[PDB]
Design a protein around this ligand. Structure first.
Ligand SMILES: [Mg+2]
Ligand SMILES: [Mg+2]
Ligand SMILES: [Mg+2]
Ligand SMILES: [Mg+2]
Ligand SMILES: [Mg+2]
Ligand SMILES: [Mg+2]
Ligand SMILES: [Mg+2]
Ligand SMILES: [Mg+2]
Ligand SMILES: [Mg+2]
Ligand SMILES: [Mg+2]
Ligand SMILES: [Mg+2]
Ligand SMILES: [Zn+2]
Lengths: 36, 142, 165, 206
RNA sequence: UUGGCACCUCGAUGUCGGCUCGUCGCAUCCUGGGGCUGUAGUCGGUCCCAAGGGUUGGGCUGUUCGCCCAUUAAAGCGGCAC
RNA sequence: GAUAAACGCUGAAAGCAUCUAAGCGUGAAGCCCCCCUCAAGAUGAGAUUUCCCAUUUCUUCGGAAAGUAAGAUCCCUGAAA
């Protein structure tokens, strides 16, 4: 998981979602997991 | 001069029973504080206690808007170093609702000797049953 | 939402009971959203176009559909053990897995779910409550999830595991 | 869960069958009687009240005599409640013998520790002395009362004061021997209190 | 921290280090839980949750600091009139 | 027992997808219990068992004082304190 204030798609597969009022990107590529 | 002043045991203090079900914790508290203080009576005298006795029933069904159930924290400090204990309004509404309403109402009473006497006139019950039937309590609406 | 033969759907205030051949279900929905029960087909009604209602609408539809399809042909989640010395034994109501731990791992199915084991290498989870099937299936996969180096461990049958060196 | 009251007689040792030598405390527990059963209906909790050692009439009063008359027994020196017991066992006036325990039973011994009177921080709280030489004028003192900022001393600054005479529970003592005709328990190791001290022996909570 | 300012104290607010006694913060040294890994395993790296408890004895120097010896699960960093 | 990070299940909003919006579960030496001790001046002064009983003269009145009960103390011998 990358935890950082700048969360943004790293590839085309990256999807930006919101869980519990937290922006995050989920992706097939586990390196691209990000939470804000 | 001539302005009326209530004497102790002059004004008839009545017993009221109030259903807490679905009412915001405040809103219920603020109305009850006024009844306890005697603000609803024209005999109101600031130094005497002319107010009524209040039984609150169904305190377990008291309303907490927003995320207050999880996010409203009640703190206690023992006065020992690092002796700060915390409870959520939610947990306290489940386990000790009599405590929750007493805290809420205590905060809205005068912070003095008479204020401490007023608090003694408040009886809170989690359920629908009190044991003050002898005092012939009359239902009160908010 | 079409009701198949054998199914009877009833509504009591907000809650809706569904009793069929495979089993019997009870699920409580949000009140303001209303459901119109007819002998053949089920049409769920939305009063206002507020974000809350738009969401609940699709959910009440989806869950009711799942409930009805639940009690008809039933739900089946299939699992597949990979790796040398990975096996599953069915003894009584207990699913006993040997997945490489020093101890054996055992699962007792809840009320309304079955864990019949055709071959030692694979497991199948039958039930009518899809979420109860999903959870038990996940809980069994949770014991040894698939690792990325040789693909060993408990995987879903259709699952696609990422692989490394 | 079983319980009894005895007096600490003293300590000795016994050789085990193995050949090992273990220290034991001898608890004499004669004249335990069941005086009263407390129920949830009556008192709001389950407990059996046991009266221990017989006491001369003139040392009792009419309140006491009335209480033990309900159990057809003489006044009792020590009365204690046991909770977590099975009330189906215990009849009012029934003797409670040491054979409620067996060799190997793990018990918790509760008693009042020996009185040491007024004691300093070194003995009472195991604090360190200051240096004894190199110009030191600090030896058996309590240390700084605390920082400056909170113009006051915090509430657990350990200081001199009365030391022992506190209730203590030692957990998980093995019963080594049970002698019925002598009303004696042998408990491996030591239990709180001076000789003749009341000791409450009950089944280990753990 | 190194500083700037000169607002309390010059009819006195004792100033470094150590000792004793701690207590608090968490930006966590160890132990617990977890995500990613250029994670085969054993070791690690990095980030997230976590402050419950724990967090050594010596040589040198007034020292703090630091280097060193030998350990340790670890030898945390800070505040409290340094 | 309830949670953190986290992992999920079911699941729409957004015919897909999605751990989340409704709804279920897993999940920390941490939180609350459990363990040990103090604790009803908890003036909100709680509970149980047992004991003593309704005395005398006054006080228009309310109350007052003066012998006692159960019980306790002074005093004395002491220590396990
Ligand atoms: Mg002594
Ligand atoms: Mg020392
Ligand atoms: Mg000296
Ligand atoms: Mg102050
Ligand atoms: Mg100037
Ligand atoms: Mg001066
Ligand atoms: Mg942190
Ligand atoms: Mg200083
Ligand atoms: Mg899904
Ligand atoms: Mg749990
Ligand atoms: Mg531990
Ligand atoms: Zn991506």
């Amino acid at each position: 998981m990358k935890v950082r204030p700048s969360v943004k798609p790293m590839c085309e597969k990256c999807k930006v979602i919101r869980r519990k009022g937290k922006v995050m990107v989920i992706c097939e590529n586990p390196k691209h997991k990000q939470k804000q | 001069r001539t302005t009326y002043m209530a004497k102790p045991g002059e004004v008839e203090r009545k017993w009221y029973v109030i259903d807490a079900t679905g009412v915001s914790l405040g809103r219920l508290s603020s109305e009850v504080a006024s009844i306890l203080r005697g603000k609803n009576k024209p005999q109101f005298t600031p130094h005497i206690d002319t107010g009524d006795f209040v039984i609150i029933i169904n305190a377990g069904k008291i309303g907490l808007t927003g995320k207050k159930a999880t996010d409203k924290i009640y703190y206690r400090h023992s006065q020992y170093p690092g002796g700060l204990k915390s409870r959520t309004a939610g947990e306290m509404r489940t386990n000790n609702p009599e405590k929750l309403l007493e805290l809420s109402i205590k905060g809205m009473l005068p912070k003095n000797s008479l204020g401490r006497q007023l608090f003694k006139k408040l009886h809170v019950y989690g359920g629908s049953e009190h044991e003050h039937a002898a005092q012939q309590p009359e239902v009160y609406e908010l | 939402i079409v009701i198949p033969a054998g199914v009877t759907v009833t509504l009591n205030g907000s809650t809706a009971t569904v009793k069929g051949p495979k089993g019997e279900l009870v699920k409580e929905f949000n009140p303001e959203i209303t459901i119109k029960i007819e002998g053949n087909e089920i049409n769920v009604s939305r009063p206002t176009d507020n974000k809350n209602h738009r969401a609940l609408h699709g959910t009440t539809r989806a869950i009711l559909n799942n409930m009805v399809v639940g009690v008809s042909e039933g739900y089946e989640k299939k699992l597949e053990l990979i790796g040398v010395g990975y096996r599953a034994q069915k003894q009584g109501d207990k699913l006993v897995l040997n997945v490489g731990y020093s101890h054996p791992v055992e699962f007792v199915a809840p009320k309304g779910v079955d864990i019949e084991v055709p071959a030692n290498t694979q497991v199948i989870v039958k039930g009518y409550n899809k979420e109860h099937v999903g959870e038990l299936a996940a809980n069994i996969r949770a014991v040894r999830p698939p690792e990325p180096y040789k693909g060993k461990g408990i995987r879903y049958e259709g699952e696609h595991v990422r692989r490394k060196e | 869960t079983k319980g009894i009251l005895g007096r600490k007689v003293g300590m000795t040792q016994v050789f085990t069958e193995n050949g090992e030598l273990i220290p034991v405390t001898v608890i004499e527990a004669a004249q335990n009687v069941v005086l009263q059963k407390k129920t949830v209906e009556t008192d709001g909790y389950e407990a059996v009240q046991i009266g221990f050692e017989d006491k001369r009439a003139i040392l009792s009063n009419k309140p006491e005599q009335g209480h033990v008359a309900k159990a057809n027994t003489t006044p009792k020196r020590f009365i204690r409640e046991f909770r977590d017991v099975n009330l189906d066992e215990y009849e009012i006036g029934a003797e409670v013998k040491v054979d409620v325990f067996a060799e190997g039973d793990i018990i918790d011994a509760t008693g009042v520790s020996k009185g040491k009177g007024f004691q300093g921080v070194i003995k009472r709280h195991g604090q360190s002395r200051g240096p004894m030489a190199h110009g030191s004028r600090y030896h058996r003192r309590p240390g700084s009362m605390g920082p400056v900022a909170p113009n006051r001393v915090f509430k657990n600054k350990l200081l001199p004061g009365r030391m022992g005479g506190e209730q203590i529970t030692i957990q998980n003592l093995e019963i080594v021997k049970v002698d019925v005709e002598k009303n004696v328990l042998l408990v491996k190791g030591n239990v709180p209190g001076a000789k003749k001290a009341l000791v409450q022996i009950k089944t280990a909570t753990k």
